[PDB]
TrEMBL record:
The keyword Nucleotide-binding applies. FMN binds at residues 23, 25, 56, 98, 226, 293, 295, 316-317. The lineage of its organism: Bacteria, Bacillati, Cyanobacteriota, Cyanophyceae, Nostocales. Signal peptide: none annotated. Ca(2+) binds at residues 12, 14. This is All1865 protein. The keyword Magnesium does not apply. It comes from the Bacteria. Keywords: Calcium, Flavoprotein, FMN, Metal-binding, Nucleotide-binding.
């Protein structure tokens, strides 16, 4: 009888429970986009998680899309992250870094030399983007040259190697939520005619090349991949998600990864006519550990673990507001309510001051 509190062997790591802290952008980086002691407190408070996945962290300057998100490209950023991984480990936890490149979800004001954001195809996102001068229309991104794709892969590889020097236990590739890798995956955002567009094998090529590079830095059992098959976030949608994401799930098996992590969009059932990509399809296709996420509770999480539908369950919103979420779930305690107005930016309030039981 396994449940949310059962231990799990994740490669060489013993996880004390099946509860994962999902990656959560909090936009509280310091000067130079460097993590600092307040960030270390925040993650240290949550070290009872079976595994923490740290917030999306840009692997290279062009991969930033929102003010004040941390990076993992500079020595100062490695040193600030070391504060965080030191604290997590002192508190008996385990933490992977989520490696990010936003692709077209950015603005020139956030890019080096005021350049265009890069993408598979020159398609401006709809709406507005936050900059250091407030909100502005998105611009049309530049479509990467075929010859530039090795440089993207190398930026992810270096980001991964910097994460290893920062003392993380592993890394998660952010291939979800309409960021650069997802922009290549999905046919709504990828109109390319080279070997990185068209057929699914081509649209998955960036993800597979990034994963191969990262597994040359980390033991593969310390490398995870996140997908979000039915999100519509950031204007990024695929016309045949079952075929696209089922293919990806199988194609990742060669790498013997730590896990596949599925963010199950909250509106999937009500949007369209029903869920077009049952997570069970991906569970059957991917031969390793599966993390599921999206609206979980004690009762939903226990159910998926008991019936072999997933191995780990990640919680986002509840970990914002409940630093001791595992303890609270275990004893059916009250749960603190998350305050969205302090999700992003700021200081201790809405970050490290949510109370423990
Ligand atoms: C404030 C906030 C920030 C987020 N930042 C990230 C991120 O950095 N990386 C990511 O992959 N997902 C991110 N997400 C999505 C969450 O990881 C999670 O998948 C989503 O909130 C659904 O899970 P939940 O219902 O348990 O909150 C974020 C969500 C929230 C609420």
């Amino acid at each position: 009888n396994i449940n949310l509190f059962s231990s799990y062997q994740l490669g060489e790591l013993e996880l004390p429970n099946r509860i994962v802290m999902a990656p959560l952008t909090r936009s509280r980086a310091g000067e130079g986009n460097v993590p600092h002691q307040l960030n270390a407190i925040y993650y240290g408070q949550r070290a009872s998680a079976g595994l923490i996945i740290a917030e999306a962290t840009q692997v290279t300057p062009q991969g930033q899309g929102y003010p004040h998100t941390p990076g993992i490209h500079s020595p100062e950023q490695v040193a600030g992250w070391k504060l965080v991984t030191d604290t997590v480990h002192q508190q008996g936890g385990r933490i992977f870094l989520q490696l990010w490149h936003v692709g077209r979800i950015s603005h020139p004001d956030l890019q080096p030399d005021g350049g265009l954001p890069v993408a598979p195809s020159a398609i401006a996102p709809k709406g507005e983007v936050l900059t250091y001068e407030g909100k502005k229309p998105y611009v049309t991104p530049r479509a990467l040259d075929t010859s530039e794709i090795p440089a993207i892969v190398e930026q992810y590889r270096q980001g991964a190697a910097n994460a290893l020097a920062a003392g993380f236990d592993g890394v998660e590739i952010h291939a979800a939520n309409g960021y650069l890798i997802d922009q290549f995956l999905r046919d709504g955002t990828n109109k390319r005619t080279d070997e990185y567009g068209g057929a699914i094998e081509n649209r998955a090529r960036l993800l597979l090349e990034v994963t191969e590079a990262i597994t040359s830095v980390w033991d593969s059992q310390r490398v995870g991949v996140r997908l979000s098959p039915l999100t519509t976030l950031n204007g990024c949608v695929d016309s045949h998600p079952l075929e696209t994401f089922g293919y990806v799930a199988q194609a990742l098996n060669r790498f013997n990864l730590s896990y596949l992590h599925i963010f199950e969009a909250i509106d999937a059932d009500i949007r369209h006519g029903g869920t077009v990509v049952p997570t069970s399809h991906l569970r059957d296709r991917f031969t390793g550990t599966l993390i599921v996420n999206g609206g979980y509770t004690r009762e939903k999480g226990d159910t998926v673990i008991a019936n072999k539908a997933a191995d780990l369950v990640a919680f986002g919103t509840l970990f914002i507001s409940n630093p001791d979420l595992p303890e609270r779930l275990e004893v059916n305690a009250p749960l603190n309510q998350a305050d969205p107005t302090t999700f992003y930016g700021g200081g201790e309030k809405g970050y490290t001051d949510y109370p423990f039981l």
